[PDB]
Write a protein that binds this ligand. Structure first.
Ligand SMILES: */C=C/C1=C(C)C(=O)N/C1=C\C1=NC(=C\c2[nH]c(/C=C3\NC(=O)C(C=C)=C3C)c(C)c2CCC(=O)O)/C(CCC(=O)O)=C1C
Ligand SMILES: */C=C/C1=C(C)C(=O)N/C1=C\C1=NC(=C\c2[nH]c(/C=C3\NC(=O)C(C=C)=C3C)c(C)c2CCC(=O)O)/C(CCC(=O)O)=C1C
Lengths: 486, 498
C-alpha cells in the first residue's frame, strides 16, 4: 500500500522524446542542462553545449521572443511560445513551453487553429453549462473532450472519500471497450501522484512505450540538488504505471485533473489505440473544459436545491400550521411525518432528547437511538452527521443494517444535543472493479482489467446535498415551534 | 406626466370584492374595520361587528390557527392560512393572508383554489425550474418562464417585460394560447408603469386583478385605530387598484391581469405580466409558484451573464497570447497593436479604437479624426467617474460628437490608470434598427371627462419608428475583454519604462 506512495515520480532525470528539454541560468540564458535527444536535432555532441547562450540556436525573430517572454510575464500566460530552431537541415519550427521552479528555469520544445476551432470549443462549453445534472455534465465533458482530442476513449473518474475512484462517465468511438461504472482502488493513484496532480493539472503520454531521454546532467546548476521536474510537461512518468497502460492496451494517455476548492475531485482520463499526440493548444482547451466542468459542479449543486424549494415551501406551511395548533408537539409531528420522510429519502426519523425520544416510521427502538445519540456526541464536530454506512465507523450498528444503514443527524441546538435523526435502510448493490481489488499489484501492475463484481451490504442510498438542506430547514421549523412554546 | 406619478394608489378606500379584508386591534384580535362586501358573507352589517372577537367568526380550530399564526412568527411564511368562516348561508373556507403594516394587522380572505395541492403539481414546478435553469440564453430563459407560468396559471397570455434606462420597456418573451394577439418586442413608454407603481412593485412583487371591471367594496371605516389616518393597503393583495390602469386594460381587451416583479439588485428589472380575455383568478398557492419562477428567473439572469463570459475566454486567451508575444516583440507598442488590431476589433465587436494620451493619439480601424478624439478625451476628463464609460449614443451626452455619429455612436472608454490621463477607447458606428411600439408613443394618454390627465390611450397596435443614430448595445462580456486588453497594454507599457 504505502510502498506505492513512496516513489519519487518528480525527479527521474528523464523525459519523453517526442520533445526536447533545456535548463537555464537566465542571466544570458545559458544552457545549464539539456536532454540527450537534442543530438538528432542539431547534430552536435551533448555536454558540450552546457553553459552556451541559447540564442544562437534560435532564429533572430525567435530568440528575442524567448527573452521577452521570460520577463514578458503578463500574466505568466506566455505559453506556448512559437520558436524556430536554427539547424543543419533548413527551416523547421516548434511550440515552446517555458516555466520556473526551484530557482532553475526550464524550456521544452513540442510540435505545432482556426476560427472554426474556437467555435467548437465555445459550443462545448455551452452544452456543458446547460447540462441538467452532474452525470450529464460529465458526459458532455467526456465527449466534447473526445470530439476535439480525437482519442478513442474519454473517462471522467471521480474520487471517493477513500481515494478509491469510480468511472462516472465515458465516451468511446464505435468499437472500443468500456469501463463505464468501474471502481478502482487508491493504490491506483498513489498519494504522491495525487498530490502532484492537485497542482499540475494536465499530463500526456503520446506513446506509452517511449524511449526515455535523460538530462545532461541531472543536476540543479544553482541549488545543486536533484532536478525537480514536476511542472515539466515532458517529465517521464513512473515505469510502474507504464506497463499498466499496455495492460489496458492503449498506446497513448492524457489526463486532466479536476480540482475543486483545492482538493482533487477527479480526472479526465483519456485513452487511444494508436499512439497519438495533440498539441499543447488542445490540452489547453481540454483543461479549460475541465475547468468549466468543475465550476458547473457547484452550480448544479445550487440548482438541485432550488428545484426542490417548492414542496419545501408547501411543507413548511403545512408543518407549521399542523404543529401549530395541537396541544402536543410530538403529535403535531406525526401528522406531517410521512410527507417529510418522503421528502428526505427516508424510512423513519427520531428526535432524541436528554429526556426521551420521539420516533416516527422505520427506526430503531427508543432504547438504542439514545445509544446512537450518545455516540454522536464524541465526533469531531457538533454539526451534521451523515453517512450511507453507519457500521463502517460504528460497528455496534451492523444490527440496524436492515432499517438504518444510513443516518442523517441534525442538532437542534447551536451546540446542543437534542437531535433530529433520519434513517434510511440497507440497499444492496453490486459494484464492478478492475480485477480482484483485494489484489491490486508495492510491485507492478495487476494482470487484468475485466469486470470483477462484489455484493455490498449494510449501506443505504447516498444522501443528496439538497435533502440535507431540507433536514436543516426542517430542524429550523421544529426549532421555532419548540421555542415559541415554553 | 409627473401627475401620472402623483396618483396615490395605496390609499383607496376599497378592495376587490372577490375577497374580504379586515384589520384588528390585536390583543383579543378585535375587528377594527372591514370592507363593504363583508355584507355578502355575513348577512349582518359593518358596524355590528366593529370591535368584536374576530374569532367569534371562526371555528375552534380556525381561530386558534389564526391566533397561533398571530405570533405565527415562522418568517412571515405563514401564509396562506386555512380559515373556516362561520356564516348564515352554508360553510365558507378561505385562504387567509395576514400581514402587518402601518402599525396594524390586516387580514384578507381569498378563495382556496385547490382543496389540496398535490404531488403532480410539485413535479410540474420542478420541471419548470429545471428547464429554466438549463436555458441556453436570456431570451430562451425568458420564454421558458413565460410558458411555464402559462401552464400553471392558464392565462391566455404571458409576457416577459424588461425595463430600460428610461423606464420604458419591451416584451422580450411571450407565450400565448392560439389566437391571442402578440405583443412580442413591442416597446412601451415609462408612462405605462408610472414611478410610484414601479416603487411598490419593487417592494411588493406580485399583484392580481382577477376581473378588471370590479365593484370596489370600500372599508368601513378608513381610519387606522393606531394612527388614525387613511389605511395603507400597500401590502394588501386585495387592494383595489388605480382606475387609470383599469381602463388601460379594457382598452387592451383583457379582463384579468396578474403580474410578478423581476427584482434584481434592489432595482426593478422587469415584469412577468399575465393577461386573460375573460376573468380568471388564481389561488395564492399558484401565485406563489409564479413568484418562485420569477425568482429562479431573476437569479438565472446572472448565471447566464457569467456563462456568456466563460464562453469567451478562448478568443480572449488566444488574442492574449498572440498579443503578448506579437505585441511586446514589435519595437513600438503602437506597432504592436497595429497587428493584433483586427482580431481585437473582431473580439471587441468594433470598427475602431484608439489609445489617446493627453499628449498623443494612436488610432486603429475606422476612428474619428485625431482632433475629434482629442476633444472626446477632454470631455471624458470632466465626467465625474474614472471607470469604464459606455454609450450607444455618444452624441446624446456629448453633442459635439454628432458629426462623427456615422462611425462612433458607441464608445466604450476604458482608462489605463486610476489616473485617467490616458485611455483606450473603442468605437462602433450608428446602426439602423426598426423598433415597434404599443401605440403611438407620442400621446401616451388623453384628457378624461372633467379635464384631467389619467385616460389610457385608445390603442395598442403596432406603431413603428426607424432609429438610425445609436449603435450596437455594449455587451457585459465585451467590456471584460476590453478590461483584459487594457491589462495587457499596461504590462507592455510598464515593462518598457526605459
Ligand atoms: C502503487 C503503484 C501503482 C499501481 C498498482 C497502479 O495501478 N498505479 C500505480 C502508480 C501510478 N499511476 C500513475 C498515474 C496514473 N494513473 C492513472 C490510473 C488510471 N487511469 C485510468 O484511466 C483509470 C481509471 C479509468 C485509472 C484509475 C492515471 C490516469 C494516471 C495519470 C496519467 C494517465 O494515465 O494519463 C502514476 C504517476 C506516474 C507519474 O506521473 O510520474 C503512478 C506512480
Ligand atoms: C399615468 C397613467 C397610466 C397610463 C397612461 C398607463 O398606461 N398606466 C398608467 C398608470 C398605472 N398602471 C398601473 C399598473 C400596471 N401597468 C402595467 C403596464 C403594462 N402591462 C403590460 O402588460 C404592459 C406591456 C405589455 C405594460 C406596459 C402593469 C403590468 C401594471 C400592473 C398590473 C397588471 O399586471 O396589469 C398602475 C398601478 C395600479 C395599482 O397597482 O394600484 C398605475 C397607477
Amino acid at each position: 500500500l504505502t510502498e506505492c506512495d513512496r516513489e519519487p515520480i518528480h525527479i527521474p532525470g528523464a523525459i519523453q522524446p517526442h520533445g526536447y528539454l533545456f535548463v537555464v541560468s537566465e542571466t544570458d540564458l545559458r544552457i545549464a542542462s539539456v536532454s540527450a535527444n537534442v543530438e538528432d536535432l542539431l547534430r552536435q555532441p551533448p555536454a558540450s553545449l552546457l553553459n552556451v547562450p541559447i540564442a544562437h540556436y534560435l532564429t533572430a525573430a525567435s530568440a528575442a521572443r524567448l527573452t521577452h517572454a521570460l520577463h514578458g510575464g503578463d500574466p505568466a500566460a506566455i505559453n506556448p511560445i512559437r520558436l524556430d530552431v536554427v539547424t543543419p537541415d533548413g527551416e523547421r519550427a516548434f511550440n515552446g513551453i517555458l516555466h520556473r521552479h526551484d530557482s532553475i528555469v526550464i524550456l521544452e520544445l513540442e510540435p505545432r487553429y482556426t476560427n472554426e476551432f474556437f467555435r467548437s470549443v465555445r459550443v462545448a462549453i455551452r452544452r456543458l453549462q446547460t447540462a441538467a445534472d452532474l452525470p450529464t455534465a460529465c458526459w458532455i465533458a467526456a465527449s466534447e473532450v473526445r470530439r476535439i482530442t480525437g482519442f478513442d476513449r474519454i473517462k471522467v473518474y471521480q474520487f471517493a472519500a477513500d481515494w478509491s475512484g469510480q468511472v462516472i462517465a465515458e465516451d468511446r468511438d464505435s468499437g472500443i471497450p468500456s469501463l463505464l461504472d468501474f471502481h478502482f482502488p487508491s493504490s491506483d493513484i498513489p498519494a504522491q501522484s495525487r498530490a502532484l496532480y492537485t497542482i499540475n493539472p494536465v499530463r500526456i503520454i503520446p506513446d506509452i512505450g517511449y524511449r526515455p531521454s535523460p538530462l545532461v546532467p541531472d543536476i540543479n546548476p544553482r541549488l545543486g540538488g536533484p532536478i525537480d521536474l514536476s511542472f515539466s510537461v515532458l517529465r517521464s512518468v513512473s515505469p510502474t504505471h507504464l506497463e499498466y497502460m499496455v495492460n489496458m492496451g492503449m498506446h497513448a494517455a492524457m489526463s486532466i485533473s479536476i480540482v475543486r476548492d483545492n482538493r482533487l475531485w477527479g480526472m479526465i482520463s483519456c485513452h487511444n489505440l494508436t499512439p497519438r499526440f495533440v498539441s499543447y493548444e488542445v490540452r489547453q482547451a481540454c483543461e479549460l473544459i475541465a475547468q468549466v466542468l468543475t465550476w458547473q459542479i457547484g452550480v448544479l449543486e445550487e440548482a438541485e436545491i432550488v428545484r426542490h424549494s417548492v414542496r419545501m415551501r408547501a411543507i413548511q406551511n403545512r408543518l407549521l400550521h399542523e404543529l401549530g395548533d395541537e396541544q402536543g408537539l410530538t403529535a403535531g409531528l406525526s401528522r406531517v411525518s410521512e410527507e417529510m420522510l418522503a421528502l428526505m429519502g427516508a424510512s423513519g426519523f427520531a428526535l432524541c432528547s436528554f429526556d426521551g425520544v420521539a420516533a416516527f416510521g422505520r427506526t430503531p427502538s427508543d432504547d438504542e437511538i439514545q445509544a446512537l445519540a450518545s455516540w454522536l456526541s464524541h465526533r469531531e464536530s457538533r454539526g451534521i452527521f451523515q453517512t450511507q454506512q453507519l457500521s463502517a465507523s460504528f460497528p455496534e450498528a451492523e444490527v440496524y443494517s436492515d432499517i438504518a444503514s444510513g443516518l442523517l443527524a441534525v442538532p437542534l441546538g447551536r451546540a446542543s444535543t437534542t437531535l433530529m435523526l433520519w434513517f434510511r435502510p440497507e440497499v444492496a448493490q453490486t459494484v464492478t472493479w478492475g480485477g480482484d481489488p483485494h489484489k491490486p499489484v508495492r510491485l507492478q501492475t495487476r494482470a487484468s482489467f475485466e469486470a470483477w463484481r462484489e455484493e455490498v451490504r449494510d449501506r443505504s442510498r447516498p444522501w443528496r446535498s439538497h435533502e440535507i438542506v431540507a433536514a436543516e430547514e426542517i430542524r429550523d421549523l421544529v426549532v421555532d415551534v419548540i421555542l415559541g412554546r415554553a
